[PDB]
Ligand binder design. Structure first.
Ligand SMILES: Brc1cccc([C@@H]2C[C@H](c3cccc(Br)c3)n3nnnc3N2)c1
Lengths: 116, 111
């Protein structure tokens, strides 16, 4: 893992409450290979490494209970093969009028180069 | 029907340092017209102190969310109601100054 210069490897994303991308920073393309528009409406489960799906399901449940929390380290499968390690600070955004959740805002920081 | 909204990043002084291109549909500006400007420069006079106070409070909240509803001057010079939900982020591995992440949605002022 590489923990220096993480600002240059950080990208923002926005999600529905059912784990779909509704927005992604163009910075993801240089880091992981995806174009933001191809992520839209797609599930995080299409990209989590198989070893991490479980923990990330629990982590999402933790997020929904706490309102904000860090994800724990996990791996995203990269567009052209292999994966990168990353970690996410998640924040649920609520409608103040009825306190229903509207979306999840994420600050994602990539912790490695693409690995096999 | 999905809300119309866009993400922005600000320094703690309120200056836009990143703007998601959904801003065009939301408030009419290209991202390059917002970058480098303070959010308060688009704020209705009656809401300017409110917005300053909101940005001050969000820094004190050290990552927790604050939300504010205020009037934002669109590219067509019309006052749009915006609800901004904001929080700070700081890279946990360094001591970089924190910045502010906002999600900005056009909402109704109606009962
Ligand atoms: Br793969 C991938 C790459 C970047 C961001 C994401 C986010 C991650 C984020 C999430 C999941 C679990 C805990 C936390 Br904190 C955040 N989330 N919530 N709903 N959908 C998602 N997808 C996934």
């Amino acid at each position: 893992g590489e923990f220096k210069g993480l600002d240059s490897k950080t990208f923002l994303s926005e999600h529905s409450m059912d784990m779909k991308f509704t927005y992604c920073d163009d910075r993801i393309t240089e880091l992981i290979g995806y174009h933001p528009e191809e992520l839209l409406g797609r599930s995080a489960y299409e990209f989590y490494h198989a070893l991490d799906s479980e923990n990330m399901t629990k982590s999402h449940q933790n997020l929904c209970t706490k309102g904000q929390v860090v994800s724990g380290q996990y791996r995203m499968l990269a567009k052209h093969g292999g994966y990168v390690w990353l970690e996410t600070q998640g924040t649920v955004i609520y409608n103040p009028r009825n306190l229903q959740p509207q979306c999840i805002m994420c600050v994602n920081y990539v912790l490695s180069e693409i690995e096999k | 029907c999905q809300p119309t909204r866009f993400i922005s990043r600000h320094n703690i002084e309120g200056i836009f340092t990143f703007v998601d291109h959904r801003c065009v549909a939301t408030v009419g500006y290209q991202p390059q017209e917002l970058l480098g400007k303070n959010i308060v420069e688009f704020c209705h006079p009656e809401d300017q102190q409110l917005l300053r106070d909101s940005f001050q409070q969000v820094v004190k909240l050290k990552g927790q969310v604050l939300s504010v509803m205020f009037r934002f001057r669109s590219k067509n010079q019309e006052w749009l109601w915006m609800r901004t939900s904001s929080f700070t982020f700081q890279n946990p591995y360094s001591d970089e100054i924190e910045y502010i992440i906002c999600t900005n949605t056009n909402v109704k002022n109606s009962s």
